[PDB]
Symmetry: D2
Subunit: 317 residues, 4 copies
């Protein structure tokens, strides 16, 4: 019995009997993702090349304008803007949205998979909205998700009711629910990290990886996959199980990925799917941020694999 993103979202709103802002917000995000997907696939490229005689900027403008027109937001934090964007009073609603409009776009020259990431928080006070209102821990997320522009376009959406996966049918521009209440494998067989920073790894990381290549219980060594695009590496981790690591290195002693609009939403998706997401010292979702662009080290995926890493990490004090 077919179900679409629009129908799904409205039905969650009907059950909850909320004010409707979250529903309008997600519909706005839905439209922007379809417009980003069409541009990522290079629709209209022939006009650029003279048939009749930017991409990360356009994605940011799409998300920004669609979110403002939802009447559901008051503060917007993007990977693309230095300071938080404050919505003008006439378009202001109560939700705070942090997003990376096109993560991995550094390498789109080689047609690597890219994606969009978002996290939605509720503003708690009646004070005037400000950049501080986006300094909330991940635990406060109302909803989070990502769109992956891979071989097909897929939207993964996490709320309290669980994680659901929608495939974009480009023939009719509709998102079709194809995976309900997704749960990650208890243990995977793939680890994912840039091993080129091996000289700089913390000893816990170096040892954890060595166990993956030379298992102490005499099982099969893990395979390694590292696309270099965060959305792709995490989505594969969700689908197949396993582990993804972006630990601290010398260029990034607090890690490289951004807490507000990369780490937290992915951790929210992981935890809602029965996986885990840790910095090494605490859950990603428990870090209290002090800067909207602050970084975080991240280890996430199947819970047996993350717990195995935490045991190596704790053994190294």
């Amino acid at each position: 019995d077919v179900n679409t993103l629009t129908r799904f979202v409205m039905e969650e709103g009907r059950k909850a009997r909320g004010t409707g802002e979250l529903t309008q917000l997600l519909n706005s995000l839905c439209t922007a993702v379809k417009a980003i997907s069409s541009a990522v696939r290079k629709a209209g490229i022939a006009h650029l090349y003279g048939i009749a005689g930017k991409l990360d900027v356009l994605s940011n403008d799409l998300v920004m304008n669609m979110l403002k027109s939802s009447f559901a937001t008051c503060v917007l934090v993007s990977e693309e803007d230095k300071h938080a964007i404050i919505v003008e009073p006439e378009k202001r609603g109560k939700y705070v949205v942090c997003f990376d409009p096109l993560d991995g776009s550094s390498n789109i020259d080689c047609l690597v998979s890219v994606g969009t990431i978002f996290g939605i928080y509720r503003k708690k006070s009646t004070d005037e909205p400000s950049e501080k209102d986006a300094l909330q821990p991940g635990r406060n997320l109302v909803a989070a998700g990502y769109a992956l522009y891979g071989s097909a376009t897929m939207l993964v959406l996490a709320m309290d009711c669980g994680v659901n996966c929608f495939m974009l049918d480009p023939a009719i521009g509709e998102f079709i629910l194809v995976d309900k209440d997704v749960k990650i494998k208890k243990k995977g067989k793939i680890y994912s990290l840039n091993e080129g920073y091996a000289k700089d790894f913390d000893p816990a990381v170096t040892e954890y990886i060595q166990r993956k290549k030379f298992p102490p219980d005499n099982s099969a060594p893990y395979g390694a996959r590292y696309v270099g695009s965060m959305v792709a590496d995490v989505h594969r981790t969700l689908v197949y199980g396993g582990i993804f690591l972006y630990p601290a290195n010398k260029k990034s002693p607090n890690g490289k990925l951004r807490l507000l609009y990369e780490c937290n939403p992915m951790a929210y998706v992981m935890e809602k799917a029965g996986g885990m997401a840790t910095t090494g010292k605490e859950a990603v979702l428990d870090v209290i941020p002090t800067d909207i662009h602050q970084r975080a080290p991240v280890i996430l995926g199947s819970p047996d694999d993350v717990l195995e890493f935490l045991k190596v990490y704790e053994k190294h004090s």
Copy 2:
């Protein structure tokens, strides 16, 4: 001045004044690639999920390539990753070319929306015998043309011939491949290495030492970055665009490698060499291996020439 695949392919034929079969061959191939992309992007998936009340993708892709190539009247022997024996084209549809292809490489992991691709290489039939499986048992040196289509964030067709390597982007709005990169050449030296390091305990010692040099450079220069998508077309195109090295080498458990020579290694090796790169098995150029079985495997190290030459020095130092 805008240029399309259809126009480009036709202009190459006019310059050469050939029989036209190769031009029809590429036209058929182009149509098949556009149909694979539309299905890889899941156009029509809503019908599978009951919007109005079914072949797996790699089966559909093989059916598209096989049917378009036969209908071109330009081929006589077809070798696919999907069939144990060669397909011999029936007489009324026969032309003079032998085509080896992998219709949807990487589809084992398409469940996670990883980049996938189509790879092809084209040879001319060499003997006066009846066409047979023997006719595809040619070395890569004999390739007339080869290339790949990558279904990544966008769809791109990379086509290599004697004139060099040219890259075409599919405009999905109008279904045209637009020429966007003419006469592409790989960087002389890169900063990325690509291989599955999870199988490190099985590596040949030469591979183990080379990987150590990329992570721990002896001259105190920058260590390389690593990428491994796991889809061959995706990793090779990244190597073509950014430079660096891709390895699927021999080890003691797999003395002839894992990848297939006729429809993976050779076409990728031809594109590399026409773009100024290198492709070796360790012992010889990939394009010089003479196959004995249409599905035989080969180890492959390819990419920027400086990175590959430095690899061969470690491999030789391990006499």
Copy 3:
């Protein structure tokens, strides 16, 4: 400030605070119209012609299944089915839907514009659902509209708030609001009917057309257009003004077009746009039907032209 069908529909529902079923119904119909459009434009025809080794039936199946899966319907009347379709109990909602899934498809061989027509009623009694629940006069319509699959695809939606026109952007599969609260011209310059049947015309019809071709005063004769597809002829009348006629004659005393899923929805659109729609004897929206497939004569369009028509019709009565 950009506006989509999804956003429009949700905002009208928030203002009204209904139970949400009509919003889910309109969302389902939107998905059906996009799927019909993709099939009408022949996406996938290369597979029918053997690249890898009806249309109105498919349209009826898309509408039926999208409407049934909406949980908002209990009786469905389609031009394609002999009997009313009763929705199964677990999927039953409160709305009755009458529709023609692919109007004009008799002539789709020549790529003429075709269309979808629908009208939405609220079930009035608590009796078990039956064909009777669709036997309501057009005055009881909650909403109505049509989709035109012409050179572009457009959805025209009429409610109490008025008539709004949405253009389908096929690049992203979104309906974009392009014409808000549309109103027809007081008087037009085009008449539309099949003149090949002049030998069978009622005499009032013959004189009315003669005044349009040989005006008794010193004005310009009207132009004539007749596409043969009701949706296209009615949309042009809506946009340019004028008059559309499928009148009664002596061989067809009730006209040829069907009342429940052609005349009533189109008449409802006309009246919300400030136009008029008559059988000759009464307003189309006032006819009380006794059979779900009964025919009705319909003259509709600009009010001055319809009133001039009724003036000739009374002279011959």
Copy 4:
């Protein structure tokens, strides 16, 4: 056995063993038709309406012009959109003259009526330097002609010496699929098509011919009437279902309404290759020798029996 426009056009050239210019021209034209169809269907309209914060017939003209020029197969271009003929620059000059209407019917695209593209191709006949004179050839000299209809689906109809063939565009994969080979019009149809709002201006022959279609003297069934208002749509219906299409002269248009070079001549060429007829009343459309690239002409066309029945009434009226 599946067949595409690209495959079709190349096989026709291989049979003929020409210089290749005509094949490159039709390949360009194909691309332009796919791009126009994409714009006619309003792909990207959400960006115009502010989703991120040329007129359709001008864009259509720039697509055909640019695609044709870059083909290296043309030397003179006549468009409905340009007052004077376009002379291709020398580095890109080929031997063909092309007459086209980039977006026929766009006056009424406001209501999403079917629109279309019409083209006609001649070989340049004289040896002088290219000029507007080179497009003043009679329709008889056409090498190829056709039209694209942007209707409920997009279809390209192409007529050559080998006949008339119809290709449906599959928008999923941007390919023209051959669906109707060697098309022939019915000997006699049952539909007539014209704007009857000009009845007060009709010459007596048109008035009598029409009167016969509504009140047949043989007490047989009256014809049905259809009039879309877009020439490509009305002519395509006439080709597919049979019948007759008329746009005769009126007081607003004493030399007719439609243009001879890029509307009448191509449609007449298609009619004649499908076994139909096309006349002005005085002569076959394809026999008129034009004197101006934008000159108008009256046209009666369609099933051969229906046109001859019209010519018989036309003769009866001196």
